[PDB]
Amino acid sequence: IKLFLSTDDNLSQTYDLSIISKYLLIASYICSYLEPRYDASIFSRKNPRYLQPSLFAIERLLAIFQAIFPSLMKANIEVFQNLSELHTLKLIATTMNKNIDYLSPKVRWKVNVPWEIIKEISESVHFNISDYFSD
Amino acid sequence: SLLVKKYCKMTTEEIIRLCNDFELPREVAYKIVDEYNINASRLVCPWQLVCGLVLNCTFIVFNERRRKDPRIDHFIVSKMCSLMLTSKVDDVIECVKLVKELIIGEKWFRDLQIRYDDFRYDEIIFRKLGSMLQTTNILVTDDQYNIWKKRIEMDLA
Amino acid sequence: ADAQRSHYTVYPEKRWELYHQLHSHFHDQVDHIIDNIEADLKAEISDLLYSETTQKRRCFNTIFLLGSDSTTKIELKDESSRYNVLIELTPKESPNVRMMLRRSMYKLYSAADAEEHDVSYDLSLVENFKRLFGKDLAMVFNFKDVDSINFNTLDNFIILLKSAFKYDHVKISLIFNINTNLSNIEKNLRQSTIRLLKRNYHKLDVSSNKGFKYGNQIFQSFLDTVDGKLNLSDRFVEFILSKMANNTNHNLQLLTKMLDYSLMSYFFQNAFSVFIDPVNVDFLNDDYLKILSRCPTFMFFVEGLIKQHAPADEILSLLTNKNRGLEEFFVEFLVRENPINGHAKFVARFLEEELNITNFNLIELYHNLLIGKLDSYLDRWSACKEYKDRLHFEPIDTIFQELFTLDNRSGLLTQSIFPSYKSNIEDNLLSWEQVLPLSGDLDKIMAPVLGQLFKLYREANMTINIYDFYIAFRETLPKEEILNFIRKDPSNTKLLELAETPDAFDKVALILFMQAIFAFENMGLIKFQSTKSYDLVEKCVWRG
Amino acid sequence: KSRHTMSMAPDVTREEFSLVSNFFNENFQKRPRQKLFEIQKKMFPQYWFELTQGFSLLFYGVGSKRNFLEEFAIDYLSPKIAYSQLVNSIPCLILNGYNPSCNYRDVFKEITDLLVPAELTRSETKYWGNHVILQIQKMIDFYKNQPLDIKLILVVHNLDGPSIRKNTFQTMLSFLSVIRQIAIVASTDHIYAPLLWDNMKAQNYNFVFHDISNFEPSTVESTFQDVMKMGAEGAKYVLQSLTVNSKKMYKLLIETQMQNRGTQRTGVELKLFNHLCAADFIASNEIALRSMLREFIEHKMANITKMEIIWVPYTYAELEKLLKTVLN
DNA sequence: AAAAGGCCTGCAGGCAAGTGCACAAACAATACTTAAATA
DNA sequence: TATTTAAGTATTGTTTGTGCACTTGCCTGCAGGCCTTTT
Numbered sequence A: 001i002k003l004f005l006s007t008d009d010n011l012s013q014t015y016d017l018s019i020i021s022k023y024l025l026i027a028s029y030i031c032s033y034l035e036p037r038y039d040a041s042i043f044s045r046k047n048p049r050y051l052q053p054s055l056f057a058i059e060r061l062l063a064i065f066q067a068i069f070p071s072l073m074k075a076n077i078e079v080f081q082n083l084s085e086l087h088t089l090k091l092i093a094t095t096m097n098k099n100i101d102y103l104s105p106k107v108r109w110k111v112n113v114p115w116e117i118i119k120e121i122s123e124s125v126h127f128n129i130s131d132y133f134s135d
Numbered sequence B: 001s002l003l004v005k006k007y008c009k010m011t012t013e014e015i016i017r018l019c020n021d022f023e024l025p026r027e028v029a030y031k032i033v034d035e036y037n038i039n040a041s042r043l044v045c046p047w048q049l050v051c052g053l054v055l056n057c058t059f060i061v062f063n064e065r066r067r068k069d070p071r072i073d074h075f076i077v078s079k080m081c082s083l084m085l086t087s088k089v090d091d092v093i094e095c096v097k098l099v100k101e102l103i104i105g106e107k108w109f110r111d112l113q114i115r116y117d118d119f120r121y122d123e124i125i126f127r128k129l130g131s132m133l134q135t136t137n138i139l140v141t142d143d144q145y146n147i148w149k150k151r152i153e154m155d156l157a
Numbered sequence C: 001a002d003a004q005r006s007h008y009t010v011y012p013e014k015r016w017e018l019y020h021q022l023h024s025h026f027h028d029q030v031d032h033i034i035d036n037i038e039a040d041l042k043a044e045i046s047d048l049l050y051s052e053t054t055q056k057r058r059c060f061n062t063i064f065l066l067g068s069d070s071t072t073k074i075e076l077k078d079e080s081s082r083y084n085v086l087i088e089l090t091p092k093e094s095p096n097v098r099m100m101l102r103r104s105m106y107k108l109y110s111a112a113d114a115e116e117h118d119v120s121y122d123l124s125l126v127e128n129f130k131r132l133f134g135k136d137l138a139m140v141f142n143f144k145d146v147d148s149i150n151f152n153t154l155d156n157f158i159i160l161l162k163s164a165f166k167y168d169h170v171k172i173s174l175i176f177n178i179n180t181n182l183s184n185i186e187k188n189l190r191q192s193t194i195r196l197l198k199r200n201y202h203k204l205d206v207s208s209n210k211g212f213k214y215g216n217q218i219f220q221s222f223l224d225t226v227d228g229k230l231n232l233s234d235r236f237v238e239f240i241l242s243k244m245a246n247n248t249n250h251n252l253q254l255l256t257k258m259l260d261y262s263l264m265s266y267f268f269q270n271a272f273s274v275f276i277d278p279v280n281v282d283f284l285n286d287d288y289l290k291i292l293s294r295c296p297t298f299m300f301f302v303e304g305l306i307k308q309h310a311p312a313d314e315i316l317s318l319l320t321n322k323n324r325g326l327e328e329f330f331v332e333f334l335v336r337e338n339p340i341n342g343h344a345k346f347v348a349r350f351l352e353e354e355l356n357i358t359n360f361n362l363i364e365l366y367h368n369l370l371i372g373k374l375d376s377y378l379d380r381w382s383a384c385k386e387y388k389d390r391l392h393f394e395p396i397d398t399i400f401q402e403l404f405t406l407d408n409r410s411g412l413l414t415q416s417i418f419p420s421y422k423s424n425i426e427d428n429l430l431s432w433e434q435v436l437p438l439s440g441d442l443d444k445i446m447a448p449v450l451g452q453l454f455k456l457y458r459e460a461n462m463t464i465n466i467y468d469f470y471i472a473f474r475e476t477l478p479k480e481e482i483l484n485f486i487r488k489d490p491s492n493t494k495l496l497e498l499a500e501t502p503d504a505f506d507k508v509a510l511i512l513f514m515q516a517i518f519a520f521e522n523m524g525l526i527k528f529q530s531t532k533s534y535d536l537v538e539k540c541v542w543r544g
Numbered sequence D: 001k002s003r004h005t006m007s008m009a010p011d012v013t014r015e016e017f018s019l020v021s022n023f024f025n026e027n028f029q030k031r032p033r034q035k036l037f038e039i040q041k042k043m044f045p046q047y048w049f050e051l052t053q054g055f056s057l058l059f060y061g062v063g064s065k066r067n068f069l070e071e072f073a074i075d076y077l078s079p080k081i082a083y084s085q086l087v088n089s090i091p092c093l094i095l096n097g098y099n100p101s102c103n104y105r106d107v108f109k110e111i112t113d114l115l116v117p118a119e120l121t122r123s124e125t126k127y128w129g130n131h132v133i134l135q136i137q138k139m140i141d142f143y144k145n146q147p148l149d150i151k152l153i154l155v156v157h158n159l160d161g162p163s164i165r166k167n168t169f170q171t172m173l174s175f176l177s178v179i180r181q182i183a184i185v186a187s188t189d190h191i192y193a194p195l196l197w198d199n200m201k202a203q204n205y206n207f208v209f210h211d212i213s214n215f216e217p218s219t220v221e222s223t224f225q226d227v228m229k230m231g232a233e234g235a236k237y238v239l240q241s242l243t244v245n246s247k248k249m250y251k252l253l254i255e256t257q258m259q260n261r262g263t264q265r266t267g268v269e270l271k272l273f274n275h276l277c278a279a280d281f282i283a284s285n286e287i288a289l290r291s292m293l294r295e296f297i298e299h300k301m302a303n304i305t306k307m308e309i310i311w312v313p314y315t316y317a318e319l320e321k322l323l324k325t326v327l328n
Numbered sequence E: 001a002a003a004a005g006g007c008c009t010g011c012a013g014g015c016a017a018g019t020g021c022a023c024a025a026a027c028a029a030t031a032c033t034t035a036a037a038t039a
Numbered sequence F: 001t002a003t004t005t006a007a008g009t010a011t012t013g014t015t016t017g018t019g020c021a022c023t024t025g026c027c028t029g030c031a032g033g034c035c036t037t038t039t
Helices: A019-028 A061-068 A077-089 A115-125 B012-018 B026-041 B046-061 B071-083 B089-103 B107-115 B121-127 B142-156 C014-049 C097-114 C124-133 C151-166 C182-188 C191-197 C215-225 C234-245 C251-269 C278-283 C286-291 C296-308 C312-317 C324-331 C339-354 C362-371 C375-381 C412-417 C421-430 C440-445 C449-458 C466-476 C479-486 C493-499 C504-519 D014-027 D030-051 D066-085 D104-114 D131-143 D167-177 D199-205 D219-224 D232-239 D244-258 D270-279 D286-297 D316-327
Strands: A092-094 A109-111 C061-066 C082-089 C136-143 C170-176 C203-205 C463-465 C536-539 D057-060 D092-096 D152-157 D182-187 D208-211 D303-305 D309-311
Touching: A019 A061, A019 A077, A019 A109, A019 A115, A061 A077, A077 A092, A077 D199, B012 B026, B012 B046, B026 B046, B026 B107, B046 B071, B046 B089, B046 B107, B071 B089, B071 B142, B142 C296, C014 C061, C014 C203, C014 C215, C014 C251, C082 C097, C097 C124, C097 C136, C097 C151, C124 C136, C151 C170, C151 C191, C215 C251, C215 C339, C215 C362, C234 C251, C234 C362, C251 C412, C251 D030, C251 D199, C296 C312, C339 C362, C362 C375, C412 D208, C421 C449, C421 D057, C421 D208, C440 C479, C440 D030, C449 C466, C449 C504, C463 C466, C466 C504, C479 C493, C479 C504, C493 D014, C504 D014, C504 D219, D030 D057, D030 D066, D066 D092, D066 D152, D066 D182, D066 D219, D092 D104, D104 D131, D104 D167, D131 D167, D167 D182, D167 D199, D232 D244, D232 D316, D244 D270, D244 D286, D244 D309, D244 D316, D270 D286
Parallel strands: C061 C170, C061 C203, C082 C136, C136 C170, D057 D182, D057 D208, D092 D152, D152 D182
Antiparallel strands: A092 A109, C463 C536, D303 D309
């Protein structure tokens, strides 16, 4: 019996990525529902969970990152390092081409990870995300 | 011991007393006032940062005698060790060292160093530009080390 | 002048010798372990590639490379009487199905030619192959970097290849170089094709970072390369640990990089490198004697003498009053063996084979060692309770080490290896004085154009007007100094005639502005939103 | 929503603009530039000892490097380190990254002959199947067992260039910089430089960073780029080359459009415009009128909206300038 | 003084002004292939 | 019978095109709130 009841056709991973990468990704997920109309409100220094994600823009990701990174960090070499790591892992891909993305022309970035891995990364990093989604 | 007695306000009048008994000149006095104004918004424990910053400013406002006479270096820490009613020298040297590190990069320090022309550019051009031949501050500079050596020697001998 | 052409080429120490003879030992052990891991990978992949006689023999066997760097070269068996042709496909080589097929066919045909010494670039080449080359064929496909290839195309291609199994004189095998996340792959392909790959797969991993069996091992080898010859403060070790933890894929390469760079800094500024070996005690100079005074160990031990030795006479006589006696007093403690390294290797190999512990890091172990929390380190597994007194090591406070060591207190390496690339720019631009020291008047009374424009830049909102900023900058512009400076050059005729133009202020304002906004686009700060419009722009960077 | 538009700006001829940029950029902060440069020149033996270990030297810091780049490379590094090896000074391969005509294929075709042609590797030249990457792989396998000395020094101006930054070109240069016997030194301007390289490309590059801020005007870089100054003045030369009838009809247009910055309210209606150009006996009908008008239109020399307003978007100042100078 | 008929005003009922812009196809000429002329 | 590459083939790369959109005023539509009386 112990086989007749499951396909077992599969041959949530604790992704190798690191802390700064965890936060990069978990912030780049925040505008799959939070348009720039609200972020400067819910994140200031003072359902589209289902639908396909809207397009980010750079320096917004950096914004929310520097916001929710646990003044502690301003260096951006490892940050962009892991950003390029991500983009090689096709977790936050660009709608535009594959070569000029790394300029600053019209170029949009969007997450390509579903929400379960987001839950995983949040719990593992111990930061909570149920807050920023409100409806 | 006044130093251990933290959680006290040093108002414009009080801080100008703390910087007038030691007679500090106009620019440094007003910078002490303004930096305590700033440091009140960002203090963790007031007395430590206060004594550190004042001693580190006084030790360079009068280098034309400190470097010239090693005894006034002990004289200042003695007259404030009693004014702050401290325990020994050790705690005051902790204070000075740490706070001096905490004020070594603030623009006011560069301005005090450049303005009076007493004696910095050589260190900024080797830290910003990044030479391998700048001093890594694990040692003590030969000038402050000369100060320490000479002062502790004439006090001991 | 000509420079606007495209890439037109132009066709125009004892300390250092110790650097050589030691740095080279370092790199030698590095490259040793490097070739070890490389041969290991080649061996395991060549092994797993064969001997798996799967009686089905109608489905190519698949070899996944978990966490693969995608740079791992592959070798094959020579295996006479049957060509072993490797095929490598890059996500660049894959625009569609047809061109993948053609490029692959051309590659394998050229390889059959090189092994062989008119043909259709298609599947026919397979079955004709025997007739056209004699030996039977066995190809293997190496999709270099799969994650980026459009999986619909790859899927269609695999279904295409499936047809080749009706000739029986060929056999195929697939080598997936997944960057990571096998779940990512099994998320995109058609399940009916997974069920074609799943016939005989092997989740072989290729990761330089796995249980640190290479990480911890190279760390230990480095410890050995630095044994008894220098030291490394807790700050150094914790910094290494931190910067390592944020670089997942290639820790080792970066680890070697930072260690080598620290060594280079030392051997290019530290003057006491010549004093890890007694053969250069005669290499001492009076100025070296002076610089060995300002040591922190020196002052600490002078204070300890004054405290403990109440009679000041011995301390005073052993002081600068003597120089040969003083330098002997110094070299007295030069030979502190620092068992820290010895007991470190001890506990390392111990918990490697006595306790046989793997999922651990010798780096943070050495950190704890220098701290002394090694108990709250080994506790992590609850198996050294019986050994925490035989693997016991209280940290020893060695002396005089403040000359034979390395620590990042000046952040030279950190600032030169891990700079704040945007913060450094914002600082040096807004401040600009710490770097910048007839016409000196304006430089002394008016900032360089870059920074004095950056500062107006700062107060700008998301979308800004070109000309509003132009006027707000005109405010900053001293017309009195602009006429001071333009007519300050009488030697030129045309510039003088320019200097008398009555509306020259706003003209030169627009000139300087259209040079500055010009040079501030390739620098990335401002974006010329909507070229062909350029009526407004956006300030990309913010301070933060 | 009356915004300051760059139209309402004091334009400067290309000659005056160029010449004042010359005066400034060659005299603005000379003494600072030379002091900074003579100070930072002392770092050059530091660069020598750093590149002894092949650490790719990346240069950041505001102001152009191009001048300073060729300065440090061509004059100090190449021939000194060539002499230091124990003879042609090692060919300085300068990459005009600002020049958008650089392509990986041809530059590698150069590189090949620069590098050791010890075997007929041209035999490995094949179809479009890129032998750049495969041949450079082979070249790396070769150099892995070759002696360690710089056999060519390449230097890239503005590594963020419009061509080099193309990810293909970037990866090619990465796999290149893996080679030990070559010294890689370059610089950028894009503040987002670190976005370019993953840990794979960093591992390939082993970048070591250095700030260089000297606050240059980016002379060469100002050349390839272009802004709106680089229209009213466009038509100003057109009208300088026309027929007298066109001159007179545009004269009448400019009077009746400047009578009321030349705004749209100040124009004229084509009904009354035909009435006028027929009264003074210029236009025979509407077809010939619109014909002799489209010669202005077919170069966008006058605006038309709706009344039938033909309004010159050129400024009242520039318009009356046309009147007083080139028309009358 | 409060609870029950009746009538007044705060919330928004709403949508065209309107710009961004993310979709598409040739696009201008890439990069490379394959037959010919000369030793 | 082979090095010349010149022309040609196959392919890249990119250009504006729009197709859709989604925004931000607008007074009116509506409805909770104020007036009145009786015990």
